[PDB]
C-alpha cells in the first residue's frame, strides 16, 4: 500500500512559478524513483522528469523536480510558464512491491483572464418526468474561469455522493468554463426528502443554490 496525493488544481499567471507537489501517504518516497508525466487533454502522457531530478531530451529547462524525505513528498517546480504548459501533471512513483503508483492528477491552468465565481441554476425534476418514475435532478454550473471545480450535493440532511455522474468541465462561448452534475433520482426519493442543494467548491469559494418540490 503506497499512495501519492497531489493538489487537485494549481494555477498561476504567466512568467510566475508553480510548484506541483505530491505526498506519499504510506511507504517512503526516497526508496524508489519519482517521475512526472504531462498529459494534455486528448493525448498520451509524456515524461518530463525522471530519476527524481533529470529531464528527458527535448524537455525545456523551465521544469525541475525535487524530493523531501523529511515530509515524505515530491515536487515539480515549473518557472516561466507559457500558454502551452497548461495540462494535467501526474506524479508517478513505485511501491517496494513493484507497483507503479500514479498520482491523483493536478490540472495546471495558466491564467489568461480574471477569476470568476460559478453561477449555478438548479432544475426541478420536471413532474412530467416524475410521472415516468424518474426525477434526475440536474445541476448546471457555469461562469467560472478555472476549469476545475468540485461539485458537492446535499440531501435533506446528508451529502449525496452515491449515484452521481459529473461531467468534465467544458468551455462555453463566453471563453469561460461550465460543467454539470446529474443525480439519478426518482419521485420516491424526491418525495421522501424535502430539500436539495448544489454547491460548487471552487478556488477559495463555494456557491450553493437550493431547490424544493
Partner 1 sequence: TNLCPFHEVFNATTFASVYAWNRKRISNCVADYSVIYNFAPFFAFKCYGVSPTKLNDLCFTNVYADSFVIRGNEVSQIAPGQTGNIADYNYKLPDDFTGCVIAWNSNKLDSKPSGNYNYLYRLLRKSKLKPFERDISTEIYQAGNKPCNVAGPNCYSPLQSYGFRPTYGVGHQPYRVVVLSFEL
Partner 2 sequence: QVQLQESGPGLVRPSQTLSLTCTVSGGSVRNEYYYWSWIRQPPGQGLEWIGYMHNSGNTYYNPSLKSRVAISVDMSKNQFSLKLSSVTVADTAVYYCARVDVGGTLVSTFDHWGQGILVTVSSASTKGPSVFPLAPSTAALGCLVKDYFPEPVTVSWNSGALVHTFPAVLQSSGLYSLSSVVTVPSSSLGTQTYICNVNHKPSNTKVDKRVE
Of 14 and 104, the one with the shorter C-beta distance to partner 2 is 104
H or E stretch including 80?
Answer: none
200 and 206 in contact (C-beta within 8 Å)?
A: yes
In the list 5, 9, 19, 47, the residue contacting partner 2 (rule: CB under 8 A) is: 47
Site string for partner 2, 63-102 (x = CB under 8 A): -------------------------x-x-x-x--xxxxxx
Residues 125-144 that bind partner 1 (CB under 8 A): none
Question: Using CA atoms, how far apart are residues 122 and 209, in angstroms rounded to an integer?
Answer: 7
16 and 55 in contact (C-beta within 8 Å)?
A: no
Minimum CB separation of residue 32 from partner 1 in Å reads 6
CA-wise closest residue to 73 among 167, 142, 4: 4
Residue 32 binds partner 1 (CB under 8 A): yes
Say which entry of partner 1, partner 2, none residue 84 contacts (CB below 5 to 8 A, set by partner kind): none
In the list 17, 60, 80, 132, the residue contacting partner 2 (rule: CB under 8 A) is: 132
Site string for partner 2, 139-158 (x = CB under 8 A): -x-x----------------
CA-wise closest residue to 192 among 162, 165, 158, 161: 158
Which set of grid coordinates corresponds to residue 30?
526516497
Residues 84-113 that bind partner 1 (CB under 8 A): 94-98
Of 24 and 118, the one with the shorter C-beta distance to partner 1 is 24
DSSP 125-190: --HHHHTTT---EEEEEEEESSS--EEEEE-SSSEE-TTEEEPPPEE-TTS-EEEEEEE---HHHH
Minimum CB separation of residue 50 from partner 2 in Å reads 4
Say which entry of partner 1, partner 2, none residue 96 contacts (CB below 5 to 8 A, set by partner kind): partner 1
* Residues at the contact surface with partner 1, assessed by CB under 8 A: 32, 94-98
Amino acid at each position: 500500500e503506497f499512495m501519492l496525493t497531489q493538489p487537485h488544481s494549481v494555477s498561476e499567471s504567466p512568467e510566475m512559478t508553480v510548484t506541483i507537489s505530491c505526498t506519499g501517504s504510506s511507504g517512503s518516497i526516497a526508496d524508489n524513483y519519482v517521475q512526472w508525466y504531462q498529459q494534455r487533454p486528448g493525448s498520451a502522457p509524456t515524461t518530463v522528469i525522471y530519476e527524481n531530478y533529470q529531464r528527458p531530451s527535448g524537455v525545456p529547462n523551465r521544469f525541475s523536480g525535487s524530493i523531501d524525505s523529511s515530509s515524505n513528498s515530491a515536487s515539480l517546480t515549473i518557472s516561466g510558464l507559457k500558454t502551452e504548459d497548461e495540462a494535467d501533471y501526474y506524479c508517478q512513483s513505485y511501491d517496494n512491491s513493484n507497483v507503479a503508483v500514479f498520482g491523483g492528477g493536478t490540472q495546471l491552468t495558466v491564467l489568461g483572464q480574471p477569476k470568476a465565481a460559478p453561477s449555478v441554476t438548479l432544475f426541478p425534476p420536471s413532474s412530467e418526468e416524475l410521472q415516468a418514475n424518474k426525477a434526475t435532478l440536474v445541476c448546471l454550473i457555469s461562469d467560472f474561469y478555472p476549469g476545475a471545480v468540485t461539485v458537492a450535493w446535499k440531501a435533506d440532511s446528508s451529502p449525496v455522493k452515491a449515484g452521481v455522474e459529473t461531467t468534465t468541465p467544458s468551455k462555453q462561448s463566453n471563453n469561460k468554463y461550465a460543467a454539470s452534475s446529474y443525480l439519478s433520482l426518482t419521485p420516491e426519493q424526491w418525495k421522501s426528502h424535502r430539500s436539495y442543494s448544489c454547491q460548487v467548491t471552487h478556488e477559495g469559494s463555494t456557491v450553493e443554490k437550493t431547490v424544493a418540490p
